[PDB]
Each structure stands twice: as structure tokens, then as C-alpha cells.
Amino acid sequence: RNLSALKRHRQSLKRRLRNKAKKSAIKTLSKKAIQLAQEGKAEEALKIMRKAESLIDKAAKGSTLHKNAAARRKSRLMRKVRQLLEAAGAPLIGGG
């Protein structure tokens, strides 16, 4: 009528919180840089875009993101920003 399955469920709800938290934060700053880049605003884009990449690879330390998902997400971010800043330029910082 009981188990450590209960323990495992409690743990999953705490790990649940943290994964969402990081993933939201990543999604926010990603689109944010992209929005800036759109009207670029090069220095500000890259500044935020530097912060997104950090939170990404940081997510891939643990269970939140698989390394390839992190790689994928960084790729699209940087790909998007550069292509967006290409309407006007000029890239004021790194990278790269």
C-alpha cells in the first residue's frame, strides 16, 4: 500500500520545476536578442545573445537539455541574429 515510488515522484516534481525554469529563461532571452537583432541594435543583441548561449550550455550540464539540443538551439539563435543584423549591420561585438 506504499513505496519509494512515492519518493521518486516527489523528486520528479522538484526536478520538474528547475527544468521548466531554465527552459523558460532560455526561451525569453533567445527571442529577446532576436527581437533586438531585428531592429539591430547590434551591441545589445550580442550582449543578450551572449547571455542566452550561456544559459543554454548551462542547461546541458544537467538533465534539462541534451547536448545536441543545446547545440541546435545555439545554432539557430546565432544563425537568426547574424541574418537579422545583415539587414543594416554592423556587428559591434562578438562573436564571431
Partner RNA sequence: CCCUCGCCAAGGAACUCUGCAAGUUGGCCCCGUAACUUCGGGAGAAGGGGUGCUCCCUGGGGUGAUGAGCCCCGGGGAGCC
Partner RNA sequence: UUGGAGAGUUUGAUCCUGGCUCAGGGUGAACGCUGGCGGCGUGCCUAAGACAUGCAAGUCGUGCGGGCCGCGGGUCCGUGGUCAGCGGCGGACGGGUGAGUAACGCGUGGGUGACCUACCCGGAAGAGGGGGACAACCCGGGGAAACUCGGGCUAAUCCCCCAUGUGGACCCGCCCCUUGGGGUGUGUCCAAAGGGCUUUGCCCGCUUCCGGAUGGGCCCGCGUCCCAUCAGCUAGUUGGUGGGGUAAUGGCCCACCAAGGCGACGACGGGUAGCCGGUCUGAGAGGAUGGCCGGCCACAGGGGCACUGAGACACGGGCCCCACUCCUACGGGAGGCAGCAGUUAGGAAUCUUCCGCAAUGGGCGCAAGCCUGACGGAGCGACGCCGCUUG
Partner RNA sequence: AGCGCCGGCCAACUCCGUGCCAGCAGCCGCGGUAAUACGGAGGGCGCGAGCGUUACCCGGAUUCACUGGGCGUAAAGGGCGUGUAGGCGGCCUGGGGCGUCCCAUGUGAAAGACCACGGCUCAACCGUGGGGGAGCGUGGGAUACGCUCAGGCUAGACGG
Partner RNA sequence: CCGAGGGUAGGGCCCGUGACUGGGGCGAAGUCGUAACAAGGUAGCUGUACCGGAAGGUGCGGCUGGAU
Mask: binding to RNA, 23-62, rule CB under 7 A, as x and -?
---------------------------x--xx-xxx--xx
Least CB distance from residue 76 to Mg ion, whole Å? Answer: 13
User: For 2, what's the count of Cα atoms within 13 Å in the CB-facing half-sphere?
Assistant: 1
In angstroms, what is the C-alpha Rg of the chain? Answer: 17
Q: How many residues does the chain have?
A: 96
- Residue 52 has a CB neighbour count (10 Å cut-off) of 23
| Binding residues vs RNA (CB under 7 A) | 1-16, 18-20, 50, 53-54, 56-58, 61-64, 66-72, 74-76, 78-79, 82, 93-96
